[PDB]
């Protein structure tokens, strides 16, 4: 199993 997809994009910084 590959890593799960994100639910939503991470923020930048």
């Amino acid at each position, epitope marked *: 199993p590959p*890593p*799960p997809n*994100a639910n*939503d*994009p991470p923020p930048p*910084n």
Partner: antibody
Amino acid sequence: YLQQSGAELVRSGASVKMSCKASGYTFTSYNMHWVKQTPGQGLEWIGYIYPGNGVTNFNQKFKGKATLTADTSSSTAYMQISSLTSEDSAVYFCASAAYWGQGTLVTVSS
Amino acid sequence: DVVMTQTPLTLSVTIGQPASISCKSSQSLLYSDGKTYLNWLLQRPGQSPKRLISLVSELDSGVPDRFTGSGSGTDFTLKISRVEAEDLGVYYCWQGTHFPRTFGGGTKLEIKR
């Protein structure tokens, strides 16, 4: 998985602090969300912290009420809610990647 | 805020029946990276939610292939090809493209036997 801290009885006007311990995925690679479930089983997003850099984003309804932190050395996320009222009695979930915590039931009562 | 409208409110189905759940967003869920952040969850009675699908159509690990997710833009569907007893509970969609993040109101799947 995500393992949340136990149930809490808290007085009106006081604060509560709950935890969410992560394992089985890369904690710092995904937003850690906190979600309130209402008695009618609606789900209401509170905010997230991205543990990779600490950035938080909130529902305007909870800004100034909720504080979200993340301890990357222990892979544990925390939520504090202050100034509790009767409408803050609820189950609170943490959620990240494919996983949800089991919920923390908070009862606001004197 | 972006409103997620989920129908029906309740599905009452027999074992083996197909089922379909609709989620319509009030604005496009297409993000600037080209991905559409639409997730489906199942919360069985008594339990925490479990994510079934992310990025509209991508099943999570261990989710049976009886589940499929489709859609784009504003109209999304979760389908179950043949309902099994363990599929009961409340399904939710939720969008991760806009702030605040928002959830649909839930569809309760109950089994007739």
